[PDB]
Amino acid sequence: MWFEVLPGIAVMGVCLFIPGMATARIHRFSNGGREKRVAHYSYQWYLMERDRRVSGVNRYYVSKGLENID
């Protein structure tokens, strides 16, 4: 009866689920298990490039805390 439309809607829902889950896992993969740094403004980009300079390995996501100072 009416539930016969549900395999097509289920396939369409999996096809809509794949881009978002995919880009969430990719942003966690390429950023050290965290969210991608959103730099919409120039101050956020300055902090981000400062992270890229202070990490030493040319990667902004390598976070350095209190262990990096004496």
């Binding site: 403004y41 120039s42 101050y43 956020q44 980009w45 300055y46």
Partner: protein, 169 residues
């Protein structure tokens, strides 16, 4: 190569203007002005004018060239030596300009121009938690009162003018 990206887009911009200014038809002229508006929007976007480039795509290419193609469809039938000859003339003059300014790193067509890429002339600071261009456009309402008055009045008058002169009575 990638440091010269605004220069490459500006050469594509001049090539597109030589394209539609040769005027094969207003149809292909409109198409050439659309492609030229897209690459000039890219030029604007690569200096940091994100809102102004989206104003290109949304207002210029989004409304006005739509109305030009709309009127070209409606007031012209549905689609040479002189066109292609003036096209290759403009293309050869622009590539000779490119060749001169890349071999000398200096040129003088009317004024003097540097031959390096235009990445050299940028600022080395930040703007904080705002865009300077966005806040200057937000200043249209707070600081630009008289400018809004004359622009809105000119648009109201423009509606009145087009309804008068297209009436035919």
């Amino acid at each position: 190569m990638m440091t010269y990206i605004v220069f490459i887009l500006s050469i594509i911009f001049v090539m597109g203007f030589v394209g539609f200014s040769s005027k094969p038809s207003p149809i292909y002229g409109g198409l050439g002005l659309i492609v030229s508006g897209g690459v000039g929007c890219g030029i604007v976007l690569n200096f940091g004018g994100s809102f102004l480039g989206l104003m290109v795509f949304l207002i210029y290419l989004g409304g006005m060239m739509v109305v030009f193609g709309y009127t070209t469809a409606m007031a012209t039938e549905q689609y040479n030596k002189v066109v292609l000859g003036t096209f290759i003339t403009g293309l050869l003059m622009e590539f000779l300009m490119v060749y001169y300014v890349l071999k000398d790193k200096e040129v003088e067509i009317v004024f003097k121009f540097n031959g390096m890429g235009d990445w050299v002339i940028y600022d080395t600071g930040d703007s904080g938690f705002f865009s300077e261009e966005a806040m200057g456009i937000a200043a249209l309402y707070s600081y630009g009162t008289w400018l809004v008055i004359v622009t809105g009045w000119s648009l109201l008058i423009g509606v009145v003018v087009i309804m008068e002169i297209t009436r035919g009575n």
